[PDB]
C-alpha cells in the first residue's frame, strides 16, 4: 500500500533561559523511529524503533549533525520572526515545521508537503506542485521572496522526490516485519443503560496498526484514535439506542469488514 | 533521513 515518512520540528523560545527548546520526531507511517531533544543528555539523534538501530554509527552521526542544523535555523527564525512582528524580547514564541514524502503502491514518489507555523498559526507552506510557496501574511511574503531568491523549493523538491523516497523504501525493507505487516483490530462490544428507555452500545476497536480506521453506525459519539503505548492504536464508537444502523469495522488489516 | 541544510532563515 501507500507509505509516508514525516518529520515534525518544534522550537519554543524561552526568554533568558538559554537556547530555545528544540524537539524533533520522525515517523514512518504511524511508527516513530527517531527523536531529538535539545535538553537531552545524549545531544544526538536517538532511535524509537528496533529496526532503525540496524544503521551503523555513520548514519547516526549524519542524522545528529543535520538535526542540529535544523535547530540552528529555527533559532535564527525565532529571532527573525520576533523582528518581523515587532514583538518583545521577553515573550515566549513557537515555530513548527513539518515535511515529508509519500509513495504509492509502486513505492514511487506520490506526494510531497512542507508546512511552517509560528505561534500555532499558519505562516508559509509549500504547494502540492512543489514549486511555489503560499504566504499567510506580509511577513511570510518576505520569507517567500527570500526563499524564492535561493530557489529553496527546487532543493526541497529534489529531496522529497529522491533522497526522501529512497530512504523511505530502505526503512520499509529493514522494518518489513513491523512496518509492512498489518495488525487487525480485536473488537468487542459493551452495553450500558443511560436513561429511562434508551441505552448505549459501544463498538470497541483495540490493538490495530496502522491507525487509519472508520467506525460508524449507518443503514454516533466517537473519540480520537489513541495510542496504546505498544505501537498499536485504539478507538471506540458508540450510539444511544432504545439494529437498522449497525457497527461496521473497516481496517486495512481485515480482509473483509466486520459487523 | 533528514534533508541537508539547504533552508536559510525565514
Amino acid at each position, epitope marked *: 500500500g501507500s507509505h509516508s515518512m514525516r518529520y515534525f520540528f518544534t522550537s519554543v523560545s524561552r526568554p533568558g533561559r538559554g537556547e530555545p527548546r528544540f524537539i524533533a520526531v520522525g515517523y514512518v507511517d504511524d511508527t516513530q523511529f527517531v527523536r531529538f531533544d535539545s535538553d537531552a543528555a545524549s545531544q544526538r539523534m536517538e532511535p524509537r524503533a528496533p529496526w532503525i538501530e540496524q544503521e551503523g554509527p555513520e548514519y547516526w552521526d549524519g542524522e545528529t549533525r543535520k538535526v542540529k*542544523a535544523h535547530s*540552528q*535555523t529555527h*533559532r*535564527v527564525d525565532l529571532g*527573525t520572526l520576533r523582528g518581523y512582528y515587532n514583538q518583545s524580547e521577553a515573550g515566549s514564541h513557537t515555530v513548527q515545521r513539518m515535511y515529508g514524502c509519500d509513495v504509492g503502491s509502486d513505492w514511487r514518489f506520490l506526494r510531497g508537503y512542507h508546512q511552517y507555523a509560528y505561534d500555532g498559526k499558519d505562516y508559509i507552506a509549500l504547494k502540492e506542485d512543489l514549486r511555489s510557496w503560499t504566504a499567510a501574511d506580509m511577513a511570510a511574503q*518576505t520569507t517567500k*521572496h*527570500k526563499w*524564492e*531568491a*535561493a*530557489h529553496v523549493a*527546487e*532543493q526541497l523538491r529534489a529531496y522529497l522526490e529522491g533522497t526522501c523516497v529512497e530512504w523511505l523504501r530502505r526503512y520499509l525493507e529493514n522494518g518489513k516485519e513491523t512496518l509492512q505487516r498489518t495488525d487487525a483490530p480485536k473488537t468487542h462490544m459493551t452495553h450500558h443503560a443511560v436513561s429511562d428507555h434508551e441505552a448505549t452500545l459501544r463498538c470497541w476497536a483495540l490493538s490495530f496498526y496502522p491507525a487509519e480506521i472508520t467506525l460508524t453506525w449507518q443503514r454516533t459519539e466517537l473519540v480520537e484514535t489513541r495510542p496504546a503505548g505498544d505501537g498499536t492504536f485504539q478507538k471506540w464508537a458508540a450510539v444511544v439506542v432504545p439494529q437498522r444502523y449497525t457497527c461496521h469495522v473497516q481496517h486495512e488489516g481485515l480482509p473483509k469488514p466486520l459487523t | 533521513f533528514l534533508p*541537508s*541544510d*539547504f*533552508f*536559510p*532563515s525565514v
Partner: antibody, heavy 118, light 109 residues
Framework: EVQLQQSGPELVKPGASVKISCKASGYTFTDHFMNWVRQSHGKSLEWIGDINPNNGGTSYNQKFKGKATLTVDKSSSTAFMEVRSLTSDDSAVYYC???????????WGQGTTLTVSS | EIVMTQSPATLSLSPGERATLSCRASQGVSSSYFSWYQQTPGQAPRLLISGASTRATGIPARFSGSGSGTDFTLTISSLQPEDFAVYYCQQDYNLPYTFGQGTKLEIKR
C-alpha cells in the same frame, strides 16, 4: 558569458536623486535575483536589496529602506536602482550582483562611482 | 543581524606560501549560505568560494573553503601575484545580507 554592464559615473549635488542602470546578458534574466551592493571609499561591502525580475518583488536592507528603490525591465533585461535625497554619505561605488541560482553573488558588475558634492 | 568578523585586518605573507583567512559569524549560519570574495583595488569583487566550500566557475584549484556554524576558513595553497588582494566573507542566510570588514594579503619582504 554572463555580463553585467552598469551605467557610467555620476556627480550630483546633495538632495537630488539618481538612477543606476545594470544591463544583464549571457543568461536567462528571469532565473536569477539581482542584488545591489554599496561600497564606501576604503570601506567594506554592504547589501542594499534584491529584485525579483519576474514580478518586481523587492526586499531591502532596513537601513536603505526609504533611500533606495529597486525596479526591473524584463524587456531590456535591465535592473535599476533609484537613490533619492542624496547626501555626502551616499558617495560610494555601487554594484549590481546577480544572486546565484541557489545562493551567493556569482557575478558582479563593473561598478558605478557615485560622487555627491556641492 | 548576523555580524561577520574577519581577522586579522592585514595578513603579510610571502609569495608561494599557504594562506589561511578566518571569518567568525556572530550567529550560527548554514554552510550552504556562506561565500568568499576576492577584490583587487580598483576592480569589482569576484566570487571565489560559494557554499563555504564549493569553488566558483573559473577559480583556480589553489583556493579552498571550509568551516561550519560560526567559524569558516579560506585557504590558498600557493600565493600568486594575483592572489594578493582583499578578501571578504558574507552570509546570504538571514536578512539583511551582511559582509565582513575584509582582509588584505600583502607580500612579505
Amino acid at each position: 558569458e554572463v555580463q553585467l554592464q552598469q551605467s557610467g559615473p555620476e556627480l550630483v549635488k546633495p538632495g537630488a536623486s539618481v538612477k543606476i542602470s545594470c544591463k544583464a546578458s549571457g543568461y536567462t534574466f528571469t532565473d536569477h535575483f539581482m542584488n545591489w551592493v554599496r561600497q564606501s571609499h576604503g570601506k567594506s561591502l554592504e547589501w542594499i536589496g534584491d529584485i525579483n525580475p519576474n514580478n518586481g518583488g523587492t526586499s531591502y536592507n532596513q537601513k536603505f529602506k526609504g533611500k533606495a528603490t529597486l525596479t526591473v525591465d524584463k524587456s531590456s533585461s535591465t535592473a535599476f536602482m533609484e537613490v533619492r535625497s542624496l547626501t555626502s554619505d551616499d558617495s560610494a561605488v555601487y554594484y549590481c550582483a546577480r544572486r546565484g541560482y541557489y545562493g551567493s553573488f556569482d557575478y558582479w558588475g563593473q561598478g558605478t562611482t557615485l560622487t555627491v558634492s556641492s | 543581524e548576523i555580524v561577520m568578523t574577519q581577522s586579522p585586518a592585514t595578513l603579510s605573507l610571502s609569495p608561494g606560501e599557504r594562506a589561511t583567512l578566518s571569518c567568525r559569524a556572530s550567529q550560527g549560519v548554514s554552510s550552504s549560505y556562506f561565500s568568499w570574495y576576492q577584490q583587487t583595488p580598483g576592480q569589482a569583487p569576484r566570487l571565489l568560494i560559494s557554499g563555504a566550500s564549493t569553488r566558483a566557475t573559473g577559480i583556480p584549484a589553489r583556493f579552498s573553503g571550509s568551516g561550519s556554524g560560526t567559524d569558516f576558513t579560506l585557504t590558498i595553497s600557493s600565493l600568486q601575484p594575483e592572489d594578493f588582494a582583499v578578501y571578504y566573507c558574507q552570509q546570504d542566510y538571514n536578512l539583511p545580507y551582511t559582509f565582513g570588514q575584509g582582509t588584505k594579503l600583502e607580500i612579505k619582504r
